[PDB]
RNA sequence: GAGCUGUAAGCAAGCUUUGAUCCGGAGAUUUCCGAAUGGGGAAACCCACCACUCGUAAUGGAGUGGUAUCCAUAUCUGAAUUCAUAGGAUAUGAGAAGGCAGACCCGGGGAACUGAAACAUCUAAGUACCCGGAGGAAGAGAAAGCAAAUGCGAUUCCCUGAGUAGCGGCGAGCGAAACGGGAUCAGCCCAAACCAAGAGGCUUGCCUCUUGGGGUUGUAGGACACUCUGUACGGAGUUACAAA
RNA sequence: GUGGAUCCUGAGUACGGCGGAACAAUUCCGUCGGAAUCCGGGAGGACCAUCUCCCAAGGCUAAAUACUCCCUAGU
RNA sequence: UCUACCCAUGUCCAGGGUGAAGUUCAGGUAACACUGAAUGGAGGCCCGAACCCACGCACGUUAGUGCGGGGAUGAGGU
RNA sequence: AUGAGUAGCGAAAGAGGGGUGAGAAUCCCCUCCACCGAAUGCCUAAGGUUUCCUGAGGAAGGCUCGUCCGCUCAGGGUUAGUCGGGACCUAAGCCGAGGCCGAAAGGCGUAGGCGAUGGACAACAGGUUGAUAUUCCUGUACCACCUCCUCACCAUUUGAGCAAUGGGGGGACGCAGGAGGAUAGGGUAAGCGCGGUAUUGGAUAUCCGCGUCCAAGCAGUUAGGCUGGGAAAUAGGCAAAUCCGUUUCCCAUAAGCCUGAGCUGUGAUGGCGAGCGAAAUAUAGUAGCGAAGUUCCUGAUUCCACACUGCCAAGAAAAGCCUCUAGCGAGGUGAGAGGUGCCCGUACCGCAAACCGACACAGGUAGGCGAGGAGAGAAUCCUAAGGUGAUCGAGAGAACUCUCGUU
RNA sequence: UAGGCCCAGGCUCUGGGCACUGUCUCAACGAGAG
């Protein structure tokens, strides 16, 4: 990473994500080459909060089809950041 | 001493198939899992020319190896338990004894024993057999790397006592795993060929 | 976005794999021939 | 010079006559693998060291460069041998490493079937194939030649000689050259012997080491000795004719 | 240009043996040898003489020719 | 990556029976022999599940599937 | 096209009521019945690669059907310092600098590197969602490393400490057989909460269901092996060594030593737990509440432990470890307290309709657990927990073929 | 679920005797699948 805004891509808005958000946990899509400490520091810098823990998944691509052609979607990296008893990242969802 | 050519001539189970040429020959003898098929490999600086294994009964014929085209090495099956049918275990003994009794080209026989333990009954009942037909014997105590260095002279004394080795024949402590006592064995073989 | 066959068989890759093909002049000849024909997949 | 946001839909949101979309020249960026070259490896991935920078009270984390082998040039040291030398280390190297155009050409190795109604050589065939080297072309090149003349005068390619001479179980078959007609058209440089300078062994001399003049030739030339002639206002050239 | 008193014109080479290779034989390569050098040599199937042409053992040279994975214009 | 043979490292084999060598005890033998006990727990040992069998024998049909037979601590299977 | 509406459509148990729906034998629910149960159960590999969950769907596909599906389409879903692999080690094997035999293509091979199917190495019990659970949440731990810190105890090249790439030890291993000690597990008596039956008769020694609990660390304990223990000399083990030898004495018959399954209190005023049980929630039904929670008998195919005895064929290696000095050494050790801990896998199937093979199946598929009665038994028969009714039917009951029964 | 016995010789082979039976004289009925 060079600028922390290149580590976080976009937030994840689902039912599971909205459920976890009430436990003070936030879910982001992360650059596939970023590691836990990188995400921790990026969230520290961008939002000015205190981070307690970070967990990361790796997701394979899915097979899709539009008519006769077949392909795969991109791989994804997902991070669940647990903030401490501090402020609240306003995702303005 | 500086082997540069080595190959297997023929594996035989009958006197007919014995090679010809009049070259001197050296034979091997010992228990089934003592390292004699690897003694050859360690002497001629080859890895698995005479195939070895940790399962008793890997060598099942008479294998002849030409060493730099002046002599032959004879690889024989070992005695004792052999992980093969009982009927085929005595055929090897008969095959070996016939070759030893015949074959004028046989210069001397190298008998290999395990240094870790005192030699078995079969080792003595082979030393007696070789001393009774008047064939010069070189006695080799292999697997000396499994023993601490400070007990070689203690274990060799027991080896000598059990086999009642005549003062003349020497006992060379060998190790196919660290190449110890290789030059002494070569020297003894060279002496036994010419003399 | 590809198709994979036996992505766990290590012997398959150590026999017909790319790095084994590139380890001898004959394997490099094989790769050159398959590139000349226009194959989508070179080696395993 | 008026529309545009590819295929290619749709569906949104926008740009443009203060000139877009589009076309051409020159640049910038160029993740990872791959000769792949920091080490490893099941190609698209793991794990490092050094210097600097970001960050922490510090450990942990991140970014940017460098780190293969061989060869050459040196610089030191320098295993054996003291120097030297193998070597080691250090530096400087847009060096070379791989690819391809299934084409063309140089060199090396090199089949068998087939046919000869059989098979004895031969033929197939120096073909297929394999290995090495390249270049835009490539070896080829200016007579110790042809040959028998009123001689031609480097090399290469086309026509003809000729499917002839010749070689051939002289059988299958293989197979020339010179003359003549054309395409293209230039030939040069060094060594050697002599002169001048310095050194290095030798006693000066001598004698080789080098550097500048010298000279490129056969009905011999050069050196050498002596004459004119010059060093320019003339000639030649980066395509060999030194070189630029 | 005049001469031509005196030096040079390409060393284990030119040629010979020794074997295979190749195949009087023929050459290749090795295996041993081994000259001359202007009044000097080499050739014209052999050798022996006449005449006729040339000058070996140093190097560099475009063009005419071969082929096209490609690009352009066409048939 | 099938198949033949081989190498390194793991792993599996319900139960039941038989009873070797040796040892002790005695008798007994000069003493060994032997005798009898007791102990002992050996074996390509016996019966037999899991497991294995180019072992027959069908079958239906290109290797299969079933039905007998065999081995089942070993020349054992994986 | 013909054969021809022919042969097939395989085991093996279903029946009815209700629902949905255009349509029901085949889908969902209920009820009874039936089958497996050393599995047709639980978990977890190899292998597969989204097949997993929710909603929609009726082209195609599923030996019949289909409102259903492992099928189609949209959204979702996989969280680790402690699990497994890499910033650890080596086997077989592979690559193999230098090197050797070569005229050469080549062949042989050492140092070194790579390489698990083995060795090292720190976390447990509950709860939770439609889909993840020794990863999330709660509560209690552990491991390695780092100091803005706080204490304690030492030492100043007289020396406290750190200690090797060297020495020694250790990791470190087989089979068979028979004792012993425990525990998982399985069944009686107390106790708890339900019940009192309508078909003759039971307040009855009646019937039903339940009857517990981690790692960690503070204890003590079976048992086991012992190296007999100490002193000197010793230096041997390339240097050195207080370490290991090796000698010489002395005491030794039990001192000492090193390893131990399990049990007791703590973890826990915590959890779980028969059964009660809402609002109505989106009327699934949960949310929520919660009793007793012991003794006795029997007992391993698991642990002590390859501990003991017998045998030969002696059943890997290396690192991590422990020591000894050589050596480094002015600042250090031990406690707290505060911190740091990366990458890859994680859904789902795993005796299967997700794998393999497929005449297309009724086949194959490392391993761990594998209950009761009758039993030598994991055989056999019926059952427990749990799973399933297998994927064309209806009905007739001729010849004939196959598998059975009787004579 | 789970071996037929006895008397012999020859080392497993040939025997012999008994038991027992749809192997048949000679077939009949019943169950299931087609």
mmCIF file of N, CA and C in Angstrom, chain A:
data_model
loop_
_atom_site.group_PDB
_atom_site.id
_atom_site.type_symbol
_atom_site.label_atom_id
_atom_site.label_comp_id
_atom_site.label_asym_id
_atom_site.label_seq_id
_atom_site.Cartn_x
_atom_site.Cartn_y
_atom_site.Cartn_z
ATOM 1 N N UNK A 1 0.842 -1.217 0.000
ATOM 2 C CA UNK A 1 0.000 0.000 0.000
ATOM 3 C C UNK A 1 0.868 1.254 0.000
ATOM 4 N N UNK A 2 0.372 2.324 -0.602
ATOM 5 C CA UNK A 2 1.075 3.595 -0.543
ATOM 6 C C UNK A 2 0.176 4.630 0.112
ATOM 7 N N UNK A 3 -1.034 4.762 -0.402
ATOM 8 C CA UNK A 3 -2.017 5.635 0.207
ATOM 9 C C UNK A 3 -3.107 4.734 0.767
ATOM 10 N N UNK A 4 -3.529 4.918 2.018
ATOM 11 C CA UNK A 4 -4.440 3.942 2.637
ATOM 12 C C UNK A 4 -5.761 3.779 1.907
ATOM 13 N N UNK A 5 -6.157 4.763 1.108
ATOM 14 C CA UNK A 5 -7.432 4.735 0.408
ATOM 15 C C UNK A 5 -7.406 3.727 -0.731
ATOM 16 N N UNK A 6 -6.228 3.191 -1.037
ATOM 17 C CA UNK A 6 -6.103 2.095 -1.982
ATOM 18 C C UNK A 6 -6.277 0.729 -1.343
ATOM 19 N N UNK A 7 -6.382 0.652 -0.020
ATOM 20 C CA UNK A 7 -6.577 -0.636 0.632
ATOM 21 C C UNK A 7 -8.057 -0.960 0.745
ATOM 22 N N UNK A 8 -8.876 0.027 1.094
ATOM 23 C CA UNK A 8 -10.316 -0.160 1.187
ATOM 24 C C UNK A 8 -10.955 0.175 -0.150
ATOM 25 N N UNK A 9 -11.806 -0.723 -0.641
ATOM 26 C CA UNK A 9 -12.441 -0.554 -1.941
ATOM 27 C C UNK A 9 -13.867 -0.032 -1.820
ATOM 28 N N UNK A 10 -14.722 -0.747 -1.094
ATOM 29 C CA UNK A 10 -16.112 -0.350 -0.936
ATOM 30 C C UNK A 10 -16.687 -1.103 0.248
ATOM 31 N N UNK A 11 -17.704 -0.564 0.909
ATOM 32 C CA UNK A 11 -18.351 -1.303 1.991
ATOM 33 C C UNK A 11 -19.272 -2.380 1.447
ATOM 34 N N UNK A 12 -19.637 -3.299 2.330
ATOM 35 C CA UNK A 12 -20.540 -4.392 1.998
ATOM 36 C C UNK A 12 -21.863 -4.145 2.705
ATOM 37 N N UNK A 13 -22.947 -4.084 1.937
ATOM 38 C CA UNK A 13 -24.266 -3.840 2.504
ATOM 39 C C UNK A 13 -25.170 -5.026 2.211
ATOM 40 N N UNK A 14 -25.334 -5.904 3.192
ATOM 41 C CA UNK A 14 -26.218 -7.056 3.074
ATOM 42 C C UNK A 14 -27.021 -7.146 4.368
ATOM 43 N N UNK A 15 -27.778 -8.229 4.520
ATOM 44 C CA UNK A 15 -28.472 -8.476 5.773
ATOM 45 C C UNK A 15 -27.509 -8.925 6.863
ATOM 46 N N UNK A 16 -26.569 -9.810 6.531
ATOM 47 C CA UNK A 16 -25.564 -10.221 7.503
ATOM 48 C C UNK A 16 -24.693 -9.047 7.926
ATOM 49 N N UNK A 17 -24.308 -8.200 6.973
ATOM 50 C CA UNK A 17 -23.499 -7.036 7.308
ATOM 51 C C UNK A 17 -24.259 -6.065 8.199
ATOM 52 N N UNK A 18 -25.528 -5.805 7.882
ATOM 53 C CA UNK A 18 -26.330 -4.934 8.730
ATOM 54 C C UNK A 18 -26.525 -5.533 10.110
ATOM 55 N N UNK A 19 -26.622 -6.857 10.192
ATOM 56 C CA UNK A 19 -26.706 -7.513 11.488
ATOM 57 C C UNK A 19 -25.433 -7.270 12.285
ATOM 58 N N UNK A 20 -24.275 -7.489 11.665
ATOM 59 C CA UNK A 20 -23.018 -7.321 12.384
ATOM 60 C C UNK A 20 -22.763 -5.866 12.746
ATOM 61 N N UNK A 21 -23.320 -4.927 11.981
ATOM 62 C CA UNK A 21 -23.068 -3.519 12.251
ATOM 63 C C UNK A 21 -23.599 -3.073 13.604
ATOM 64 N N UNK A 22 -24.584 -3.776 14.162
ATOM 65 C CA UNK A 22 -25.096 -3.412 15.474
ATOM 66 C C UNK A 22 -24.232 -3.948 16.607
ATOM 67 N N UNK A 23 -23.292 -4.843 16.311
ATOM 68 C CA UNK A 23 -22.266 -5.249 17.258
ATOM 69 C C UNK A 23 -20.992 -4.437 17.105
ATOM 70 N N UNK A 24 -21.062 -3.301 16.409
ATOM 71 C CA UNK A 24 -19.905 -2.446 16.161
ATOM 72 C C UNK A 24 -18.854 -3.189 15.333
ATOM 73 N N UNK A 25 -19.307 -3.815 14.251
ATOM 74 C CA UNK A 25 -18.422 -4.479 13.304
ATOM 75 C C UNK A 25 -18.780 -4.018 11.903
ATOM 76 N N UNK A 26 -17.770 -3.726 11.095
ATOM 77 C CA UNK A 26 -17.984 -3.178 9.767
ATOM 78 C C UNK A 26 -17.272 -4.037 8.739
ATOM 79 N N UNK A 27 -17.910 -4.231 7.591
ATOM 80 C CA UNK A 27 -17.423 -5.138 6.562
ATOM 81 C C UNK A 27 -17.036 -4.354 5.319
ATOM 82 N N UNK A 28 -15.811 -4.563 4.846
ATOM 83 C CA UNK A 28 -15.286 -3.853 3.693
ATOM 84 C C UNK A 28 -14.758 -4.836 2.664
ATOM 85 N N UNK A 29 -14.786 -4.413 1.407
ATOM 86 C CA UNK A 29 -14.059 -5.089 0.348
ATOM 87 C C UNK A 29 -12.662 -4.498 0.277
ATOM 88 N N UNK A 30 -11.661 -5.361 0.243
ATOM 89 C CA UNK A 30 -10.277 -4.968 0.446
ATOM 90 C C UNK A 30 -9.459 -5.442 -0.745
ATOM 91 N N UNK A 31 -8.410 -4.690 -1.071
ATOM 92 C CA UNK A 31 -7.495 -5.099 -2.125
ATOM 93 C C UNK A 31 -6.929 -6.479 -1.832
ATOM 94 N N UNK A 32 -6.882 -7.322 -2.866
ATOM 95 C CA UNK A 32 -6.556 -8.729 -2.682
ATOM 96 C C UNK A 32 -5.141 -8.962 -2.188
ATOM 97 N N UNK A 33 -4.278 -7.955 -2.242
ATOM 98 C CA UNK A 33 -2.902 -8.101 -1.796
ATOM 99 C C UNK A 33 -2.644 -7.477 -0.434
ATOM 100 N N UNK A 34 -3.671 -6.977 0.242
ATOM 101 C CA UNK A 34 -3.499 -6.318 1.526
ATOM 102 C C UNK A 34 -3.629 -7.322 2.660
ATOM 103 N N UNK A 35 -2.873 -7.100 3.723
ATOM 104 C CA UNK A 35 -2.876 -7.998 4.861
ATOM 105 C C UNK A 35 -3.562 -7.329 6.051
ATOM 106 N N UNK A 36 -3.651 -8.058 7.166
ATOM 107 C CA UNK A 36 -4.445 -7.604 8.304
ATOM 108 C C UNK A 36 -3.960 -6.265 8.837
ATOM 109 N N UNK A 37 -2.654 -6.133 9.062
ATOM 110 C CA UNK A 37 -2.130 -4.910 9.655
ATOM 111 C C UNK A 37 -2.337 -3.716 8.732
ATOM 112 N N UNK A 38 -2.220 -3.933 7.423
ATOM 113 C CA UNK A 38 -2.475 -2.864 6.467
ATOM 114 C C UNK A 38 -3.902 -2.348 6.589
ATOM 115 N N UNK A 39 -4.874 -3.260 6.651
ATOM 116 C CA UNK A 39 -6.270 -2.860 6.788
ATOM 117 C C UNK A 39 -6.489 -2.142 8.108
ATOM 118 N N UNK A 40 -5.896 -2.660 9.183
ATOM 119 C CA UNK A 40 -6.037 -2.020 10.483
ATOM 120 C C UNK A 40 -5.561 -0.578 10.430
ATOM 121 N N UNK A 41 -4.359 -0.356 9.902
ATOM 122 C CA UNK A 41 -3.813 0.994 9.850
ATOM 123 C C UNK A 41 -4.622 1.894 8.927
ATOM 124 N N UNK A 42 -5.094 1.358 7.801
ATOM 125 C CA UNK A 42 -5.895 2.170 6.893
ATOM 126 C C UNK A 42 -7.190 2.622 7.552
ATOM 127 N N UNK A 43 -7.870 1.717 8.258
ATOM 128 C CA UNK A 43 -9.086 2.101 8.962
ATOM 129 C C UNK A 43 -8.768 3.090 10.071
ATOM 130 N N UNK A 44 -7.629 2.918 10.744
ATOM 131 C CA UNK A 44 -7.201 3.893 11.739
ATOM 132 C C UNK A 44 -7.113 5.284 11.126
ATOM 133 N N UNK A 45 -6.448 5.388 9.978
ATOM 134 C CA UNK A 45 -6.164 6.693 9.395
ATOM 135 C C UNK A 45 -7.401 7.337 8.787
ATOM 136 N N UNK A 46 -8.208 6.569 8.055
ATOM 137 C CA UNK A 46 -9.283 7.171 7.273
ATOM 138 C C UNK A 46 -10.354 7.760 8.180
ATOM 139 N N UNK A 47 -10.769 7.015 9.201
ATOM 140 C CA UNK A 47 -11.948 7.365 9.973
ATOM 141 C C UNK A 47 -11.646 7.902 11.363
ATOM 142 N N UNK A 48 -10.400 7.843 11.817
ATOM 143 C CA UNK A 48 -10.086 8.340 13.143
ATOM 144 C C UNK A 48 -10.781 7.595 14.257
ATOM 145 N N UNK A 49 -10.827 6.270 14.178
ATOM 146 C CA UNK A 49 -11.441 5.442 15.200
ATOM 147 C C UNK A 49 -10.352 4.603 15.854
ATOM 148 N N UNK A 50 -10.757 3.767 16.802
ATOM 149 C CA UNK A 50 -9.864 2.810 17.441
ATOM 150 C C UNK A 50 -10.285 1.406 17.038
ATOM 151 N N UNK A 51 -9.344 0.631 16.543
ATOM 152 C CA UNK A 51 -9.623 -0.703 16.033
ATOM 153 C C UNK A 51 -9.130 -1.733 17.033
ATOM 154 N N UNK A 52 -9.954 -2.746 17.273
ATOM 155 C CA UNK A 52 -9.645 -3.819 18.204
ATOM 156 C C UNK A 52 -9.170 -5.071 17.483
ATOM 157 N N UNK A 53 -9.867 -5.488 16.432
ATOM 158 C CA UNK A 53 -9.569 -6.748 15.770
ATOM 159 C C UNK A 53 -9.941 -6.641 14.303
ATOM 160 N N UNK A 54 -9.281 -7.450 13.480
ATOM 161 C CA UNK A 54 -9.573 -7.545 12.055
ATOM 162 C C UNK A 54 -9.557 -9.015 11.665
ATOM 163 N N UNK A 55 -10.530 -9.426 10.860
ATOM 164 C CA UNK A 55 -10.597 -10.773 10.318
ATOM 165 C C UNK A 55 -10.809 -10.684 8.816
ATOM 166 N N UNK A 56 -10.203 -11.602 8.069
ATOM 167 C CA UNK A 56 -10.197 -11.522 6.614
ATOM 168 C C UNK A 56 -10.553 -12.872 6.008
ATOM 169 N N UNK A 57 -11.359 -12.841 4.950
ATOM 170 C CA UNK A 57 -11.683 -13.995 4.128
ATOM 171 C C UNK A 57 -11.089 -13.820 2.739
ATOM 172 N N UNK A 58 -11.014 -14.927 2.013
ATOM 173 C CA UNK A 58 -10.732 -14.929 0.588
ATOM 174 C C UNK A 58 -11.881 -15.620 -0.122
ATOM 175 N N UNK A 59 -12.336 -15.039 -1.224
ATOM 176 C CA UNK A 59 -13.472 -15.564 -1.965
ATOM 177 C C UNK A 59 -13.052 -15.898 -3.385
ATOM 178 N N UNK A 60 -13.401 -17.098 -3.835
ATOM 179 C CA UNK A 60 -13.169 -17.461 -5.219
ATOM 180 C C UNK A 60 -14.149 -16.728 -6.127
ATOM 181 N N UNK A 61 -13.893 -16.809 -7.428
ATOM 182 C CA UNK A 61 -14.811 -16.273 -8.410
ATOM 183 C C UNK A 61 -15.931 -17.257 -8.698
ATOM 184 N N UNK A 62 -17.070 -16.722 -9.112
ATOM 185 C CA UNK A 62 -18.216 -17.534 -9.478
ATOM 186 C C UNK A 62 -18.302 -17.681 -10.988
ATOM 187 N N UNK A 63 -18.809 -18.826 -11.427
ATOM 188 C CA UNK A 63 -19.049 -19.066 -12.841
ATOM 189 C C UNK A 63 -20.379 -18.437 -13.227
ATOM 190 N N UNK A 64 -20.367 -17.633 -14.280
ATOM 191 C CA UNK A 64 -21.561 -16.977 -14.782
ATOM 192 C C UNK A 64 -21.772 -17.358 -16.237
ATOM 193 N N UNK A 65 -22.875 -16.876 -16.802
ATOM 194 C CA UNK A 65 -23.187 -17.152 -18.197
ATOM 195 C C UNK A 65 -24.207 -16.139 -18.684
ATOM 196 N N UNK A 66 -23.955 -15.564 -19.848
ATOM 197 C CA UNK A 66 -24.894 -14.660 -20.503
ATOM 198 C C UNK A 66 -25.057 -15.180 -21.924
ATOM 199 N N UNK A 67 -26.098 -15.973 -22.144
ATOM 200 C CA UNK A 67 -26.305 -16.578 -23.441
ATOM 201 C C UNK A 67 -25.360 -17.730 -23.700
ATOM 202 N N UNK A 68 -24.499 -17.600 -24.705
ATOM 203 C CA UNK A 68 -23.635 -18.741 -25.097
ATOM 204 C C UNK A 68 -22.276 -18.691 -24.405
ATOM 205 N N UNK A 69 -21.878 -17.530 -23.900
ATOM 206 C CA UNK A 69 -20.536 -17.365 -23.365
ATOM 207 C C UNK A 69 -20.519 -17.600 -21.863
ATOM 208 N N UNK A 70 -19.403 -18.124 -21.371
ATOM 209 C CA UNK A 70 -19.242 -18.467 -19.968
ATOM 210 C C UNK A 70 -17.931 -17.896 -19.452
ATOM 211 N N UNK A 71 -17.938 -17.443 -18.203
ATOM 212 C CA UNK A 71 -16.745 -16.885 -17.602
ATOM 213 C C UNK A 71 -16.746 -16.972 -16.093
ATOM 214 N N UNK A 72 -15.871 -16.207 -15.451
ATOM 215 C CA UNK A 72 -15.772 -16.174 -14.003
ATOM 216 C C UNK A 72 -15.734 -14.733 -13.529
ATOM 217 N N UNK A 73 -16.249 -14.506 -12.330
ATOM 218 C CA UNK A 73 -16.139 -13.201 -11.708
ATOM 219 C C UNK A 73 -14.825 -13.103 -10.941
ATOM 220 N N UNK A 74 -14.512 -11.894 -10.496
ATOM 221 C CA UNK A 74 -13.236 -11.637 -9.853
ATOM 222 C C UNK A 74 -13.190 -12.244 -8.459
ATOM 223 N N UNK A 75 -11.978 -12.528 -7.998
ATOM 224 C CA UNK A 75 -11.789 -12.908 -6.609
ATOM 225 C C UNK A 75 -11.965 -11.696 -5.709
ATOM 226 N N UNK A 76 -12.328 -11.951 -4.461
ATOM 227 C CA UNK A 76 -12.610 -10.887 -3.514
ATOM 228 C C UNK A 76 -11.890 -11.150 -2.204
ATOM 229 N N UNK A 77 -11.613 -10.070 -1.484
ATOM 230 C CA UNK A 77 -11.049 -10.130 -0.145
ATOM 231 C C UNK A 77 -11.945 -9.308 0.764
ATOM 232 N N UNK A 78 -12.423 -9.917 1.839
ATOM 233 C CA UNK A 78 -13.413 -9.307 2.711
ATOM 234 C C UNK A 78 -12.845 -9.186 4.114
ATOM 235 N N UNK A 79 -13.031 -8.017 4.729
ATOM 236 C CA UNK A 79 -12.496 -7.778 6.087
ATOM 237 C C UNK A 79 -13.602 -7.337 7.040
ATOM 238 N N UNK A 80 -13.651 -7.921 8.237
ATOM 239 C CA UNK A 80 -14.643 -7.507 9.271
ATOM 240 C C UNK A 80 -13.880 -6.782 10.385
ATOM 241 N N UNK A 81 -13.968 -5.452 10.434
ATOM 242 C CA UNK A 81 -13.217 -4.645 11.437
ATOM 243 C C UNK A 81 -14.072 -4.444 12.692
ATOM 244 N N UNK A 82 -13.594 -4.895 13.852
ATOM 245 C CA UNK A 82 -14.325 -4.675 15.123
ATOM 246 C C UNK A 82 -13.740 -3.458 15.835
ATOM 247 N N UNK A 83 -14.507 -2.374 15.926
ATOM 248 C CA UNK A 83 -14.035 -1.152 16.619
ATOM 249 C C UNK A 83 -14.149 -1.388 18.124
ATOM 250 N N UNK A 84 -13.436 -0.601 18.926
ATOM 251 C CA UNK A 84 -13.513 -0.735 20.394
ATOM 252 C C UNK A 84 -14.656 0.111 20.891
ATOM 253 N N UNK A 85 -14.625 0.509 22.161
ATOM 254 C CA UNK A 85 -15.655 1.445 22.667
ATOM 255 C C UNK A 85 -15.246 2.872 22.288
ATOM 256 N N UNK A 86 -15.300 3.200 20.994
ATOM 257 C CA UNK A 86 -14.861 4.535 20.509
ATOM 258 C C UNK A 86 -15.976 5.184 19.694
ATOM 259 N N UNK A 87 -15.616 5.848 18.596
ATOM 260 C CA UNK A 87 -16.622 6.535 17.750
ATOM 261 C C UNK A 87 -17.328 5.516 16.849
ATOM 262 N N UNK A 88 -17.996 5.994 15.799
ATOM 263 C CA UNK A 88 -18.749 5.078 14.907
ATOM 264 C C UNK A 88 -18.529 5.487 13.447
ATOM 265 N N UNK A 89 -17.902 4.616 12.657
ATOM 266 C CA UNK A 89 -17.723 4.911 11.218
ATOM 267 C C UNK A 89 -19.105 5.175 10.633
ATOM 268 N N UNK A 90 -19.351 6.412 10.216
ATOM 269 C CA UNK A 90 -20.663 6.746 9.592
ATOM 270 C C UNK A 90 -20.594 6.346 8.109
ATOM 271 N N UNK A 91 -21.154 5.183 7.775
ATOM 272 C CA UNK A 91 -21.150 4.708 6.369
ATOM 273 C C UNK A 91 -22.251 5.458 5.615
ATOM 274 N N UNK A 92 -23.029 6.264 6.335
ATOM 275 C CA UNK A 92 -24.166 7.008 5.717
ATOM 276 C C UNK A 92 -24.909 6.058 4.769
ATOM 277 N N UNK A 93 -25.285 4.876 5.256
ATOM 278 C CA UNK A 93 -26.091 3.969 4.398
ATOM 279 C C UNK A 93 -27.554 4.381 4.527
#
